[PDB]
Design a protein around this ligand. Structure first.
Ligand SMILES: [Mg+2]
Length: 257
């Protein structure tokens, strides 16, 4: 779906495991990665946070319920916006958390209008990621903070895996995929001051095969929301990722001075 590839009701984010002994459920691992990104966003109650690439809205709701922040989440997917808003209503947080349309490259907010920005597994969807980071720096007030989770490429791919990589990128809407150095360089070029940088590939990659397995076991019930091809591409996305070891994962924190 080019710009909409990887977005929709099936936009599922990965999880965090601590070794091969973990034995945490997929939902527990998913909450743990969210909690890892929350730890990198030093906001407090009544701060205002912009959630770029809100997915289905669950991380924004966990952030709001944990830290007491107000959240506006954005996406180009009307399905994601609708799902997220209904989730906020169900969670009794509609007065603190809302979702609306926006292209992250042209954020419809004034300058210095947010205390924080949250971008979990979202910035890879932007064809011009630097422009998105510049818009983030614009809407952050001075002293505003940013917390990013995203895929990174740890190095070149062995030729036998090269087309699995392109499948993963095409199917998942990974329009921007770089190494850590380029990511850190873009953050600085956008006017943001990097405050932390964590390579958590070893903790996150195990969640890829397990997420594929969970979707396989749910075939019967997913097919209403997504066609047989939608569910196939969904399962393929995560199984592709599990086969290419160079598809890593990193958390970044930054501050606008
Ligand atoms: Mg996604």
């Amino acid at each position: 779906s080019d710009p909409f590839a990887g977005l929709g009701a099936g936009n599922i984010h990965l999880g965090y495991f601590d070794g091969p002994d973990d034995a945490a459920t997929l939902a527990e691992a998913a909450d743990r990665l969210t909690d890892q990104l929350i730890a990198r966003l030093p906001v407090v109650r009544d701060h205002r946070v912009l959630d770029v690439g809100c997915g289905v809205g669950k991380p924004a709701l966990r952030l709001a319920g944990d830290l007491g922040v107000r959240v506006v989440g954005v996406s180009i997917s009307e399905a994601q916006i609708g799902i997220a808003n209904e989730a906020a209503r169900a969670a009794g947080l509609a007065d603190r958390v809302s979702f609306r349309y926006a292209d992250a490259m042209r954020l419809p907010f004034p300058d210095a209008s947010f205390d924080g920005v949250w971008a979990m597994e979202s910035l890879h969807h932007m064809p011009d990621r630097l422009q998105a980071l510049r818009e983030i720096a614009r809407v952050l007030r001075h002293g505003g903070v940013l917390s990013i989770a995203d895929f990174v490429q740890l190095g070149p791919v062995r030729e036998q895996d090269e087309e699995a990589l392109r499948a993963f990128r095409s199917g998942g809407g990974v329009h921007t995929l770089t190494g850590i150095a380029e990511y850190e360089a873009e953050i600085a070029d956008a006017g943001l001051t990097l405050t932390s940088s964590s390579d958590i590939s070893a903790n996150v990659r195990p969640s890829m095969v397990r997420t594929a397995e969970a979707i396989r076991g749910a075939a019967d019930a997913f097919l209403p929301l997504m066609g047989e091809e939608g569910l196939r591409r969904l399962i393929d996305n995560f199984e592709r990722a599990a086969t290419v070891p160079q598809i890593g994962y990193a958390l970044f924190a930054a501050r606008r001075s």
